Amino acid sequence: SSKLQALFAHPLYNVPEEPPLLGAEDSLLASQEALRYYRRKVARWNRRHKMYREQMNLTSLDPPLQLRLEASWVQFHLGINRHGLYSRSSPVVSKLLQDMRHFPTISADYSQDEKALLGACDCTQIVKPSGVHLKLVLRFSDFGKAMFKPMRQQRDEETPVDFFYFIDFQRHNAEIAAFHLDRILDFRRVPPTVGRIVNVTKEILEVTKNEILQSVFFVSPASNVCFFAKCPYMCKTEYAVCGKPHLLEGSLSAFLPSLNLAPRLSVPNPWIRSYTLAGKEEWEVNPLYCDTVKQIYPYNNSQRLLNVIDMAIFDFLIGNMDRHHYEMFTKFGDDGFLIHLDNARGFGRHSHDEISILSPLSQCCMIKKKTLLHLQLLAQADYRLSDVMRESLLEDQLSPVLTEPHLLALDRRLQTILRTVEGCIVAHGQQSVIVDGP
Amino acid sequence: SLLARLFEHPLYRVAVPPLTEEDVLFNVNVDSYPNWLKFHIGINRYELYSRHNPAIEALLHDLSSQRITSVAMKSGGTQLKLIMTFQNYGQALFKPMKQTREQETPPDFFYFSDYERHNAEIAAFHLDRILDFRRVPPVAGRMVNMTKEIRDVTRDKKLWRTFFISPANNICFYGECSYYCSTEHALCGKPDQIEGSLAAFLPDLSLAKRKTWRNPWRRSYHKRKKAEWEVDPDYCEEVKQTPPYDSSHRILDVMDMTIFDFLMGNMDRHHYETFEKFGNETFIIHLDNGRGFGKYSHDELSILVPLQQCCRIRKSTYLRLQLLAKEEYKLSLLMAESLRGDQVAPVLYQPHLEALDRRLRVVLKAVRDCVERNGLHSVVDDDLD
Ligand SMILES: Nc1ncnc2c1ncn2[C@@H]1O[C@H](COP(=O)(O)OP(=O)(O)OP(=O)(O)O)[C@@H](O)[C@H]1O
Ligand SMILES: Nc1ncnc2c1ncn2[C@@H]1O[C@H](COP(=O)(O)OP(=O)(O)OP(=O)(O)O)[C@@H](O)[C@H]1O
């Protein structure tokens, strides 16, 4: 019983990972520095929040915020090592996910990436930047943050045919499911993500200090508290996201460390899409595209290209065509792992498998030794990928996060990945189709 | 036959007054003319067409079958509306499918956020026809080839440049209007044909100018803002004493209109048009009826407020509205049959035809609420010459 426990109690999910970590230089956050920075951001928040309460006339009841080391996001940040975002079978992550589901919210803004758009609605732009989308950042009583993506589609709903990738929706349930897939693969690369039901009035509108964010909340003819992304509503490209009447479900994605403590590097994928109604990129037409990529810095070290292969596998399993850029932590170098930050688009076609996502594995024909073992294992009925996903997703308040056709797709898409590894082995041998590095 | 009996009834053979040279629209001082042109020269003061005209039923046939020679996108904006020119010099307005059949406009949508479906445009002509109002331009549905009848026959580069091929290898296009005119709303056939409603073209304003009045029950067209008549329960006492609405022939034209709109759910009647050459003593053209039949599990009573406030109705339509409620002359079975020949049929998802009757009895019961509060002879006007 419980194929999930069988997975993590398997010899694979227990063997030490090579190379091992010396410490200090293998934890991207330096403890004494990080605590000082966070302790200052807590002090500035207490100041500039009390002043807001004095201008709007509200008794400063309760004491100020206290920054405790025992907070989940703190221990989550100080636990980010050269081996991934979180630890294998980590008790902190379990507490982290439970905290984002239950802790009250104390602030909500528009995030940067928007806000830094300044304007900026061009109803002519077909692929407007990724900053005109409905998402907020929430802050909890323990000072931690999380990227909130609200529900945008029903469970038994697919991206309708005739919908390109760049106009596909933004599913909250796929942000969650991509995390559970991350942990099951022991890729350990997307931030922990929970599902939560949010009182959009008490937990978003009534806590935001942003005069614009208050201005996008209205009431429907059905008397439901709604809000909307300011730009798409003006262009009439999307609708609003109403509660029923206040209750709305979404996906909270834990925040990475602050870019003042851990800078990141938005790198363009080598397999970007055109992002036009027509026209294909080079890889879309040349089966020898990876022969070129292998000779371009820094894909010459034959170690960064492998991390992209893992990303292609993870994106193909979820059907995430929209991976134009992958971010990296600068401290870890060209060989550092890739962060799989915004998965909100995958899990939108349970009936279709988009093989163009697998083009890195198809054309480069090389897969990491570890990655191949976990994929092979998850094809065996005792630990089949769908069952360990189905069981792992039950711990979410938004269950069922994935409908049945989606879960069964993971199994079939796993065969396609394994069939390609074995398939392009026949043309290159286990020599160049497996990289058993340490 | 159920429909054939409706027009045998003596409520549907009362002719219009005798016409004079100042009552017609195009004095002809005429058998090779196209059916669209017979339609134009037949517009009199008190109707858009005759009850048993051979051209209106033939013009309906033309819009569905006649070959299309040129297509152009309308000017300005306000939803995607296409003008089409046929082999017989005739023109027609086109509203594409945009929404499904068993679908409902979500409850959280305001009246200004709703789509425009060909369904309501086709149905409104038949409903306006069953009520013997005859204030709508004829409209027929059609399965248009979006290649050989839209893209490959337009010189409007603004339109033509939006015809893209989809991932499903389908032909898509979206045009360049104001509301709902981007890739995310691109209308797409499987693989290359959608349906729409060719609404016949009123005569050109070059040779027939048309007034345009602001209906005094227009909504605020703004969230969180009420439109006065939502606060004044006897707001109609003011409108019966305004510049033109103090005439008996005018305070009534609105009533027939609102009973029309409420039967469909069309809460988007912000303006209405006259005919100028005709002045203030004519019918009102029921145009742009595309925002109805979007909800079948809902009756929007706010549409009927003009009747509840003014508490006045024409006995002509009153005796009709009663007859349309009896099972032998039922709106359901009458409309479902009248809409059986439209090439796009069924034009109405069934529960709309059913709702059409439930909406009739609440209109009929609303007259009774006015009749026991204001009396009879002061609620119904008389027509019997
Ligand atoms: N007193 C105020 N009056 C009006 N608007 C305000 C006021 N204070 C803040 N705002 C608006 O709300 C936002 C404030 O967010 P908040 O105060 O929670 O953190 P922040 O300092 O802006 O963000 P960060 O924590 O990233 O520095 C600002 O972007 C500003 O636009
Ligand atoms: N789980 C996640 N999913 C998607 N995006 C994320 C995630 N975590 C962090 N980010 C991105 O990282 C950025 C966070 O940096 P931000 O501009 O908020 O400064 P900060 O990290 O709060 O640092 P400080 O407030 O101390 O300046 C945001 O733009 C956010 O989009």
Numbering used by the authors:
A (entry chain A): 89 to 526
B (entry chain C): 159 to 187, 220 to 575
Sentences reproduced from the published study:
The Fam20 proteins are recently identified kinases that regulate essential cellular processes by phosphorylating proteins and proteoglycans. The human genome encodes three Fam20 paralogs: Fam20A, Fam20B, and Fam20C13. Remarkably, each has a distinct biochemical activity. Here, we use a combination of structural biology, biochemistry, and phylogenetics to elucidate the molecular functions and evolutionary relationships of the three Fam20 kinases.
The structure reveals that Fam20A and Fam20C form a reversed face-to-face heterodimer. Specifically, Ile214A, Phe251A, Phe252A, Ile255A, and Leu365A form a continuous hydrophobic surface patch on Fam20A that docks onto Fam20C residues including Phe354C, Pro357C, Tyr364C, and Thr373C. Phe306A and Pro309A form hydrophobic interactions with Phe300C, and Phe306A also forms a cation−π interaction with Lys413C. In both structures, an ATP molecule (ATP-1) is bound to Fam20A in an inverted orientation, as we previously reported. In agreement with this observation, excess ATP converts the human Fam20A−Fam20C tetramer to a dimer in solution. The various defects of these Fam20A mutants confirm that the dimer interface observed in the crystal structure is critical for Fam20A to bind Fam20C and regulate its activity.
